[PDB]
Subunit: 116 residues, 3 copies
Amino acid sequence: GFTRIIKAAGYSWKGLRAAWINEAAFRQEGVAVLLCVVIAAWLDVDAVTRVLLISSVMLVMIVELLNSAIEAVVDRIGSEYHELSGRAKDLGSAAVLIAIIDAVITWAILLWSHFG
Amino acid sequence: AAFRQEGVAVLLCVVIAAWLDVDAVTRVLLISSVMLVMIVELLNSAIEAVVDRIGSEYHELSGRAKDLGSAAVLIAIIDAVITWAILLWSHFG
Amino acid sequence: AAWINEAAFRQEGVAVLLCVVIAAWLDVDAVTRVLLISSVMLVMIVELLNSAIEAVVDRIGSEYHELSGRAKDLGSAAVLIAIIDAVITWAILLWSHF
Ligand SMILES: CCCCCCC/C=C\CCCCCC(=O)OC[C@@H](O)CO
Ligand SMILES: CCCCCCC/C=C\CCCCCC(=O)OC[C@@H](O)CO
Ligand SMILES: CCCCCCC/C=C\CCCCCC(=O)OC[C@@H](O)CO
Ligand SMILES: CCCCCCC/C=C\CCCCCC(=O)OC[C@@H](O)CO
Ligand SMILES: CCCCCCC/C=C\CCCCCC(=O)OC[C@@H](O)CO
Ligand SMILES: CCCCCCC/C=C\CCCCCC(=O)OC[C@@H](O)CO
Ligand SMILES: CCCCCCC/C=C\CCCCCC(=O)OC[C@H](O)CO
Ligand SMILES: CCCCCCC/C=C\CCCCCC(=O)OC[C@H](O)CO
Ligand SMILES: CCCCCCC/C=C\CCCCCC(=O)OC[C@H](O)CO
Ligand SMILES: CCCCCCC/C=C\CCCCCC(=O)OC[C@H](O)CO
Ligand SMILES: CCCCCCC/C=C\CCCCCC(=O)OC[C@H](O)CO
Ligand SMILES: CCCCCCC/C=C\CCCCCC(=O)OC[C@H](O)CO
Ligand SMILES: CCCCCCC/C=C\CCCCCC(=O)OC[C@H](O)CO
Ligand SMILES: CCCCCCC/C=C\CCCCCC(=O)OC[C@H](O)CO
């Protein structure tokens, strides 16, 4: 049961590693998310505000990774132009963008509310 | 078609949240939970696009992929309903 | 349909379910309760999407491709981030609660 955990953790690290190595944009996003978590962790806010600040940027990373898994599947099927290939990447990018706008807005609402 | 009725769904939820006199935290939760449903539906549709891209022939793993996807959407929606029920109950408590 | 039978989902699902039951009984304010519940729901959502990705990969066939491994690894990383987010959420909110 905890043999599945080890194996799964190993796959997870490989995914993070590959995402980091292969694109500057993912590394820069990773920097942004880590800076936000650190800032949230040190900010003088209540616990529920702290969790909202942290979990909104975490969600960006989650959807980013899920969208990148979709892209890899699409690219696996081939370099071919295909209507559903394009559509699959369009839907997934849209998801990523919603998560990001949500994080940004969540941060602006709460920090403005905090007035600091 | 079934895409913009979802856009109306969320805009209506945003209008309600705006209209209700709740604090910033409550409003973020109300709206986030609806936006998660949207994120999950889009990721699900992406997966369905990929499945249909491989072939429109039936295959156990194709059915499996779509049903797991749709189960994800259902959980997100249950999560939204729970969120709205709990926060409104507390607001009007 | 046929996936809820398997040991892997049964185990993941029961953990999430227990956490929701516990969150429902805790003496916490409303916003705290919502965050405890949706953080573990999110783990279940992401696990379900990860498995959906795995199924599409396996659907393509058994021949290994670098990008097939990558899709599964990336899906697994998302699950890990959702789980860390759940643990952080419960720790921050219930630290305050004891
Ligand atoms: C509480 C925050 C949890 C983390 C959320 C954001 C995580 C973002 C990226 C994860 C780090 C991946 C690092 C992989 C890595 O450093 O390998 C690269 C190395 O081989 C050469 O630089
Ligand atoms: C693409 C944008 C990503 C940028 C990531 C880093 C920026 C994140 C948040 C911006 C606000 C940071 C400054 C807030 C702050 O440190 O105030 C602390 C102050 O209240 C303590 O007295
Ligand atoms: C306060 C510092 C950042 C806060 C979040 C903690 C870091 C979480 C994830 C980042 C991965 C830790 C760094 C691992 C690393 O350096 O990579 C080693 C890599 O070369 C091995 O292949
Ligand atoms: C991988 C990185 C782990 C993520 C780190 C998240 C840590 C989050 C918060 C740490 C500090 C919380 C602030 C302490 C605090 O709330 O003090 C107020 C409390 O003592 C009042 O009773
Ligand atoms: C101030 C007056 C505003 C009038 C519009 C109010 C908003 C009305 C309805 C919002 C739509 C949400 C419905 C989605 C829902 O709850 O579950 C849908 C799901 O069960 C079916 O797939
Ligand atoms: C306030 C309670 C939670 C609100 C849920 C937020 C998400 C809103 C709508 C999700 C489902 C909308 C209905 C569309 C759907 O999934 O079923 C198809 C059918 O209803 C035709 O559109
Ligand atoms: C100071 C860090 C604060 C939070 C750390 C808590 C970490 C607790 C558990 C980490 C998760 C252990 C591995 C789980 C795992 O392998 O993921 C499942 C796969 O990724 C997909 O099925
Ligand atoms: C990546 C897409 C980003 C989209 C633009 C982000 C919009 C930024 C702020 C809009 C916030 C709406 C009002 C929120 C509020 O009450 O105060 C916000 C503060 O005045 C600004 O820090
Ligand atoms: C993760 C998504 C986060 C986005 C939700 C945060 C805010 C979203 C849209 C802004 C709508 C805010 C309306 C609140 C408002 O109208 O002001 C209340 C005043 O007291 C009366 O108008
Ligand atoms: C999309 C979810 C829709 C769920 C609707 C739940 C009911 C919401 C509000 C009930 C309205 C009836 C009472 C209205 C009220 O007393 O105050 C309304 C305030 O004037 C708004 O600022
Ligand atoms: C699906 C069947 C629908 C049945 C509708 C009738 C249900 C009657 C009452 C249910 C609402 C009770 C919620 C009250 C509650 O739990 O909140 C407590 C507050 O936090 C403190 O007042
Ligand atoms: C079939 C059950 C009804 C499902 C929809 C509502 C259930 C939502 C949460 C389950 C119970 C956990 C909440 C208990 C509760 O309402 O406590 C009061 C809140 O803290 C404030 O509203
Ligand atoms: C009391 C706070 C708990 C917060 C974290 C809730 C975790 C909920 C579910 C965790 C499920 C992790 C399993 C992930 C996975 O893919 O591996 C399955 C293995 O069988 C792990 O046992
Ligand atoms: C999966 C088993 C391991 C679980 C480890 C849970 C705790 C480890 C890391 C949690 C990260 C946050 C620490 C708690 C914390 O920040 O409390 C500070 C304040 O007292 C709460 O706001």
